[PDB]
């Protein structure tokens with residue numbers, strides 16, 4: 001909308017985000033690979049609501065459902081060109097919930113689905129229909145640079 | 146070749162004289178065929194006899210134990226009746242620096258915000274789970290000296306070190322140690338983690354220093370400028386609203402402009418200005434106040450100006 005701001009993100013299990021075959025995955029990065037960490041560029045819609053993206057907001061995260069298969073995906077769309085008034089753009093918006101020192105993101109377009117990482121390292125970042133299960137990690141540390 | 150072929154950017158550095166495991170870095174959508182490892186050249190397969198040091202087992206490459214001379218490229222192929230992908234990985238094996246229980250090149254950086262309780266995770270221990278699905282008992286150290294896990298200041302739970310009340314004094318390079326029993330023999334495992342403490346920064350919300358819910362005596366048919374002065378991040382949203390509506394460009398009498406100035410001392414407290422240029426005062430303008438809104442992820446802020454006729 002107006003401007004964007006870079007954020008650092010890593011789940012409670014210290015995993016960070018990076019690209020593997022143009023697919024966002026979570027894992028542990030060592031000294032040399034530290035430069036591969038992806039920061040999250042955000043544009044605030046309203047308080048507790050925002051658009052998430054990477055690479056200077058050139059690509060944005062979104063939730064799409066193929067029939068019944070709800071999945072997360074990166075799209076080549078500039079974060080600033082997104083509007084809360086355009087129906088389609090809802091897929092790039094997430095609702096920020098805060099639990100003490102941690103944060104959680106719910107898909108605006110896919111209610112009930114939260115952003116999550118797996119317990120096993122180097123797995124793609126996905127969406128979970130069951131945050132209660134605890135099998136997937138839904139809590140992150142979202143801090144602005 | 147009838148195989149996709151891909152190269153991994155991530156180069157995992159491990160310690161020498163210790164057991165190590167490397168899985169084939171494939172996304173879930175690439176787990177249809179059997180994995181097969183190869184050494185420096187894509188034609189020479191890695192040993193399958195568990196008795197040899199570098200051998201493949203359970204589709205993973207095992208270095209029992211790993212030695213510096215093993216640093217190099219390896220390949221894992223996922224083949225199927227109608228599919229084949231070959232990933233070129235890069236493995237590097239270092240040795241602990243002089244009189245140090247670790248080597249900087251193997252450091253995983255882990256951070257936590259101060260004041261609260263947090264946890265550090267000993268990376269890649271998942272491969273070393275006993276048949277009963279339990280990770281080996283880890284012993285933590287801080288800067289090569291033993292760490293007392295008294296369940297009051299530090300608690301070792303599974304593969305993580307719970308730290309109570311994070312503070313600057315907890316900064317240092319921690320090392321998690323374990324012992325895995327492979328084919329009768331027993332080998333050591335260590336991961337070096339650099340713990341960094343983050344100062345909990347305040348979630349600043351936009352502050353409107355002007356207007357301040359005031360009134361302004363204006364004459365009919367005149368021209369005025371209503372300036373909104375907000376303090377906050379340059380990324381904050383500041384805008385005008387009249388009668389719960391926003392100023393549209395198609396308004397031949399109401400035009401607004403935006404301009405911000407970065408604070409050379411503190412970027413968190415910069416000024417964002419939104420000037421509303423009223424070409425000419427119309428009767429309707431005295432009917433409702435002009436409200437300036439400033440907002441971000443944290444919260445919103447509002448202040449207005451109520452135009453009135455001069456007495």
Ligand SMILES: *[C@@H]1O[C@H](CO)[C@@H](O)[C@H](O)[C@H]1NC(C)=O
Nearest residue numbers: 248249316317318339340341
């Ligand atoms: C960990 O060790 C490296 C060098 O091996 C050093 O530069 C770094 O400052 C240490 N980390 C901390 C938190 O002291």
Ligand SMILES: *[C@@H]1O[C@H](CO)[C@@H](O)[C@H](O)[C@H]1NC(C)=O
Nearest residue numbers: 354355372373374375416418
């Ligand atoms: C905004 O910042 C302060 C408000 O008191 C002042 O120094 C400055 O002149 C103000 N400018 C405008 C255009 O309001």
Ligand SMILES: *[C@@H]1O[C@H](CO)[C@@H](O)[C@H](O)[C@H]1NC(C)=O
Nearest residue numbers: 387388389390429430432433
């Ligand atoms: C805007 O103000 C006018 C009168 O000035 C009023 O009739 C109209 O209903 C207001 N708009 C809304 C959405 O209430």
Ligand SMILES: *[C@@H]1O[C@H](CO)[C@@H](O)[C@H](O)[C@H]1NC(C)=O
Nearest residue numbers: 357358359436446447448449
């Ligand atoms: C100005 O009025 C608005 C409501 O119209 C209120 O939210 C805001 O807090 C007021 N400002 C002050 C300084 O009281």
